[PDB]
Design goal:
It is classed as lyase. The structure is a homodimer of 357-residue chains. The first copy, chain A, has 357 residues and is an all-alpha fold. Chain A is built from 17 helices and two strands. Chain A has one domain: Farnesyl Diphosphate Synthase. Helices cover 57% and strands 1% of the residues of chain A. In chain A, strand 1 and strand 2 form a beta hairpin. The complex binds magnesium ion (4 copies) and zinc ion (2 copies).
């Protein structure tokens, strides 16, 4: 059975969602916030965050329902949520307010673009951008998985002002995505996902085991250094729980898969994702444009969407339309590019030790 | 690499432990407390708890090193730890002080008895007692896995006095052990463990999936009801993280097993446990007596060790010596007894909803 707070139990009504979708979305949102932000003090901000996460959850598989262009507009209700009021409740008066408005809007924008019927030109630029370099992959995947957003929101929900540097967010996101994309590897290969680190680094278990071990070891060092402050724990709890949600949350298959993690995906799981079982989304193979959406983009994504075509790797394999054709759904790196990514991911420890002080 | 606080880095020296054992023990202890007690305010109590957990870790595979009879003695150092000073720091002035002295001492007593060369008569009485009824199994496994102890310690490490009722501890332990013993099922079958719920309930995946799903569902209900208080979260965090340590802690095999959970154990894992890889212990097939140890026993264990032989199930299969002969190592329930256990574990939801209000 699904459990969530009475405050939200009448949310998302009269929206175009069935009763079964509506209760699964509210439960997913609650369970994600609980797992990623286990320590909090401010219930008003916490529930506003859960509501923003319910809207994220809708965007992640039924993007057509979500009016991306009204998310940051004062007074606009999106599926009954006053989105900008919720973001102001969570972040107004913090040092990351403006950046997190862009982070949230940019996330749902490419959630909805990826979960659209017909692939837009803007969506194609995104899919080619996240394959352009491992550092770019990590920064754009941060927004897509809301890693820095959850870390900042967690601090905000303890009535503190997040004080992380840019290089601190970047180190933290690389650690968390290295772990999460490893656990999600078979889920994501079933979704014909573009957004998985190992779609670009390569699919050999040896590499995945190695960099998973290094990421979890760096995260234990970080936990040991940071566990005595509320901001430190806010960060630790999000990162450490990213890989663990596959066992703790009903969004995932631990029970249905016979109490296992890490069994390769089957065409059965492919069809489950297509039919939105656990609110998954299979990307099978333009209306929004750069010009219409660029106000909501954080700087690195705005740059990523305008990369000079003359500097794109020609030995990497592109497609006219991305997604599943019945693997991963995006660019296939050439051996030179793939070695650049594997090198970058293997050099994490030295990079992170520097960035994290 | 292994990470733990500078405070403990010179612990457990000149003890009969190698440098490799010593650093693995300190890391295990730190990682367990971090995972089970992620939210705390009192660093002095926290570090005292980590030290008590380091001593637990020694008892769990090399019990011969641990002088059980000096654990509760004021002024006694056990492997360099002032055990009673540490317990007083953690629990003196709480409502559970006396019960937790008995809980800790009783735990390490049967850790050391189970991890002994020659099986004692007292150890044989324990192994037959935990197979006597599912309720008795759960209460004695609570102490063995330190479930109520960790929950009470967590509250204590937030400078609060644990206020849980006896039926609250019992509900919480059944939830946590139902989850933990399921994830540990293959580890434990490799250890020829006696202390696994499914050794008694039966080994069919269907049953395990069902009761795992019910336990995790009840725990999400409990989290949703209790998450707004520090005592509530203290309880939630321990229970929810029990099954997850198999992915988060280096004590476990997630990385070495190719980033998987739930692959059946092999004779290779059996030999790993025997050779104490990750500080595991294989029980392969009397000096301490009831009279010498009964001062440290909590009431239900003192009763369990004196059960009338006339009331033991004769259709259950006992052995002169327990442990591996190259499965689970204890009593094998008869079909009548096994159905009593499966019935009890399937009736958890109604039992827990009552006990938890
Ligand atoms: Mg997704
Ligand atoms: Mg996504
Ligand atoms: Mg054990
Ligand atoms: Mg044990
Ligand atoms: Zn290339
Ligand atoms: Zn019987």
């Amino acid at each position: 059975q699904l459990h969530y707070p009475k405050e939200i139990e009448n949310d998302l009504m009269n929206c175009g969602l069935t009763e079964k979708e509506r209760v699964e979305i509210l439960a997913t949102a609650w369970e994600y916030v609980r797992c990623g932000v286990p320590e909090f003090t401010n219930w008003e901000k916490y529930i506003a965050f859960v509501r923003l996460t319910a809207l994220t959850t809708v965007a992640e598989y039924r993007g057509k329902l979500v009016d991306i262009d009204r998310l940051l507009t004062p007074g606009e209700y999106v599926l009954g949520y006053p989105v900008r009021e919720l973001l102001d409740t969570l972040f107004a008066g913090t040092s990351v307010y403006e950046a997190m408005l862009q982070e949230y809007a940019s996330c749902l924008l490419f959630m909805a673009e990826k979960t659209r019927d017909h692939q837009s030109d803007l969506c194609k630029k995104y899919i080619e951008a996240i394959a352009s370099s491992p550092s770019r992959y990590y920064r754009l995947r941060d927004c897509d998985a809301q890693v820095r957003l959850f870390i900042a929101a967690a601090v905000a929900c303890n009535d503190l002002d997040p004080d992380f540097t840019e290089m601190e967010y970047q180190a933290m996101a690389e650690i968390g995505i290295t772990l999460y994309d490893a656990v999600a590897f078979y889920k994501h290969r079933a979704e014909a996902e573009v957004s998985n680190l190992y779609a670009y680094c390569g699919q050999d278990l040896e590499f995945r085991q190695e960099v998973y071990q290094t990421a979890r070891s760096t995260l234990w060092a970080l936990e040991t250094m940071w566990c005595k402050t509320v901001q430190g724990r806010s960060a630790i709890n999000l990162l450490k729980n990213l890989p663990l949600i596959h066992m703790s949350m009903r969004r995932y298959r631990f029970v249905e898969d016979g109490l296992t993690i890490g069994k390769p995906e089957t065409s059965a799981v492919v069809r489950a994702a297509r039919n939105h079982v656990k609110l998954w989304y299979r990307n099978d193979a333009m209306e929004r444009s750069f010009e219409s959406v660029q106000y909501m983009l954080y700087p690195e994504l705005k740059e990523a969407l305008q990369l000079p075509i003359t500097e794109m790797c020609q030995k990497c394999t592109r497609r006219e339309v991305y997604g599943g054709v019945s693997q991963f759904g995006g660019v296939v790196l050439c051996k030179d590019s793939q070695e650049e990514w594997r090198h970058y991911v293997r050099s994490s420890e030295s990079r992170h030790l520097d960035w994290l002080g």
